[PDB]
Amino acid sequence: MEEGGRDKAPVQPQQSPAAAPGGTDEKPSGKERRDAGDKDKEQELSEEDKQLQDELEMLVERLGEKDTSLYRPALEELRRQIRSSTTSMTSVPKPLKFLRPHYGKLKEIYENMAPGENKRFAADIISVLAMTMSGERECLKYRLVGSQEELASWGHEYVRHLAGEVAKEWQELDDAEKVQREPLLTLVKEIVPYNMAHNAEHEACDLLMEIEQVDMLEKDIDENAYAKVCLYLTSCVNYVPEPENSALLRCALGVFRKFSRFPEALRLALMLNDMELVEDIFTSCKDVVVQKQMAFMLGRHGVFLELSEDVEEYEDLTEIMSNVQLNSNFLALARELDIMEPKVPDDIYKTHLENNRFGGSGSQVDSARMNLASSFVNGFVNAAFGQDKLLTDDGNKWLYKNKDHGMLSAAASLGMILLWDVDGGLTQIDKYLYSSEDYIKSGALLACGIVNSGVRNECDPALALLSDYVLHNSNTMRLGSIFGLGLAYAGSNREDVLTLLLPVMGDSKSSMEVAGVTALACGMIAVGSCNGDVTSTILQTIMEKSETELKDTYARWLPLGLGLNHLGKGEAIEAILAALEVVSEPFRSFANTLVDVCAYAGSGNVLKVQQLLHICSEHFDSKEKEEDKDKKEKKDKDKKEAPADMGAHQGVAVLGIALIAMGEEIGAEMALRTFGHLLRYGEPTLRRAVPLALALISVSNPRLNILDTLSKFSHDADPEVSYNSIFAMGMVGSGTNNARLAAMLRQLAQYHAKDPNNLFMVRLAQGLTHLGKGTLTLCPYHSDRQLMSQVAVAGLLTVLVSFLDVRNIILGKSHYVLYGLVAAMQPRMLVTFDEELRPLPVSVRVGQAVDVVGQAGKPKTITGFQTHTTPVLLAHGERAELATEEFLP
Template identity: 55%
Template structure:
């Protein structure tokens, strides 16, 4: 399938239009995303384009490599991309996306060489450049290297305190939120809330990453998640304007592909906000919380918004993106950084979500500017919603399963219940957020856990039909 998709893209490499070629480069990265291949087809196809003169072509190849090799810690890619960070002739956007791609490839690895390269860039940049929106992707790339590594970030955080004051606090907040992502650390959430309580006068930008950080740290378990939603409601009421612009994005991250009614109502209200950036963030977040669910209520809201904003091209663009997300893969895909019933966190999936949300902090300059393709980082978090059962030879097997809301084990002694309000379906079957499936027949024994994706079954030798 991978070879066929790459062949489909091949014809676009010979186009005379640069934008078409750049799209093909990005497409190769998307097709190879989350796929391991000893032949390294992505490197073979994209490697030659990394050193081209045209900046947009280089960016297409660099992001393609970042998507294809996210989490792989591939030394070949590092040796290909690292020289760009030290290239004095390279434009700021090329350097920023190179740093992000290296951050994705070495996500959660604490790689010192990549970290030092990014730190040198942040130290060497002119003060006038540090106010550019794309420069904020450099602290994000640094944060991705320490994703979920907690105390390991302390040395780099101390170095960040020596940066220019225009970027210092932004870098500190980004590093802190990435390092403690998914840990549920209450003290770090309190620290981030403290930064959000300040009233700024210098036009600093660090409160946006702090708001996203609250969602990142608290997303690990249900109770912390609900508390974070309540805290974000208070920030909406009392926070500065730059905080209000980040709150919808934080809500989108907390309820990714899980359209909770209270969050949906909040985002619906904010999508009509007087501040266009708050409205745009709310619209994108409506797409995120409904991603792949085909949720009828969100789809109706977005149809109404497309009529309401038909004269505003920027907001209409955001509505169309959100509509695409709600019907992601025609309802067969989901955006989910967790797997195995929220037991394991995927660093690459979370990194893709964080990168997109940080880009959305400055909608007008990045998403609505030249860099709308940053939205494609979401592909790192895409995975199938369905549960498929296969036999020992990996051939599809249709069996009855009960699908219901997951609960902690309850019921009579010796007869535990793990789901409630179930319905019986035949596999393959779609699982929504919070759903769990269990076999409705004793004819088969599962050889792998009944979780998302594939489940391997074998026939039960003791089974007899009555």
């Protein structure tokens, strides 16, 4: 301990501020010049950030705190210069003069008068002088002012431009990772008036830099991954004009302002769709801006590009609408017969060959309901041009043999055989159409809507299936005709055929399953306007469901189209609309949780997730509202699949422990459909946690509840090694786990993982994270099954052809004008880089190296090299344009 002898600064700045009350009065020079000699020297012993220990700043205030309490207030005759010497010298040590209740008094030295241009003695220092202290002001002092009194005094007026120059100072001194400190400053200051802060910070960023935009640009969208309702409403529209005004990267408009379509205003992204039609630059960024506008996140854009430039600049519209759709058919035609595809594999059924010697002999299984699953050896493998003449003879015999619902099912499988087709898809049906039967034509003409699904061109808006519908005096002609056309025009929000198919609801012909899928057919069409659909559904709901207390054919189908007509907005007006509209008995207030959370597809709104638990938690509920706690858990399944894995680990942690562990009817009947809704990628955490409750069948219940959890355990696409689980459970599933009930089911689970080699993207995440639906087409199935009796009769309309929004598969094609390039792409396990050193290496799995049409996989941001620049959108999306430039030798 070598103290003493060199303690100059603990003596003379211990004495001269102690002599400052001894020299304020009767010493006009010593009041001023010793203050200025104190001020610059204390300023100089802080500017190097290589002596944090300052020989004054924690040496003078031991008496100087009681001094400043008697020097600044008690002088009472403060001059115009001596306030600029006192407050410039004594507002510096006050974060360390004072303890944790400094937060109310960062002003009793400073805001007497802020001396001039306080960064004048705080420019080259990063945060030790006042910039940490400036964040201490905006944390607590501005928030209590700007809680209800934003428009206020000097604590707002100068504080605006004070925070303005400080936010310039973060990107001024060193331009380090304190760029991201500016959104740390802009959002803590005036949390709800963020745009009033950001509007000055938008224009300041526009003149800040054009190279130091992009990491702050991704900092915003990382903060926009989850927020409050109003913060996600605010900072996402602040996110919009920064590649519009500062830079013109601008190919991140269409999908990354589909981010901002539903929250702020539907017309606002339509004004950004107008901003697409402003910047018509060349073609290449314009091409891939409008590639996504048809079948990547929405359709319904084919009405705004038939204006005055219909030569090639507005004749991309039909090219977008069906020709690049057919060029995507040329992927599955040309490229996917080349990689690994002859017309009929037909041998996953043949992969059940070694079972016949496992335990003696075989040929014991003769169940007639297995022949339902026999259609999927032909059915699922023949998607994307698995066209079959006389390979449908297993269909052709069984169509003309028995099983009326399988006559509808085998006829509905023909639409899956010719999918995404307009050229000759109806010609395939017509030879298998004229049998003059109810079940054959109702499955085939429902499959005609599946053939032209995603086309939305002129095939039959009211031609075929409207003529099929007006044939009705009877069975599924009444039913199966409205379903296929609303499936085909689900991407559109056309009003006309909605009003053609609204007298289906207004007929009051009391076929119950017809009116239920009528809500599902109109639900797939619209998500926004036409409140008269909500009027039309609840009229027959109050007519029919009020005079019953019975089955979920009422409940699983009629409120669901209401939720599909109001999907994806956290405004909480739609809950005020719907729940106050059907104020009713609790078995009709089953519908309370539907339209509540169908508007709540994905965000962070954890306050909803607690009312998704705390109202109907357990209660033990002796067989009265057990459907509602299942459906309340059904809406826990979404608002979990979009928070990009932040709550997915928390979802599997809660729902593994809480329900299947300490539950009853909520857990052991229904709560596995989370895993059939959360992901379809597959990973051995949840893929092995389900046979913990499946190999233990727990047969005491109506075990098709647990065998429903068998079924969409294989609701993970992208074919895997999971055959080890399903075939070995199929071996114990032949004799035990009765083949009368689920011999269709286990092979439905077996044959669905290898649907096709490819085309597994059914998982509602495009580009990086945006929805693009599949929701309106998938969510009817998991609403359809959570019971029984639709494994035989009614759910066979659903279980085959429920979800049909598969949007191609990979990101290999090049499209450079003539479509001859293949390039050099380099596939890897996805990004982790958030904020690290400069050129942040994008990924980590350098081993795989392909050139052309290679697979997508679970976490793959595939990059490219060889100086082709790939300057399209720099965010992928499977129809890259790929120009050419090499000006770096």
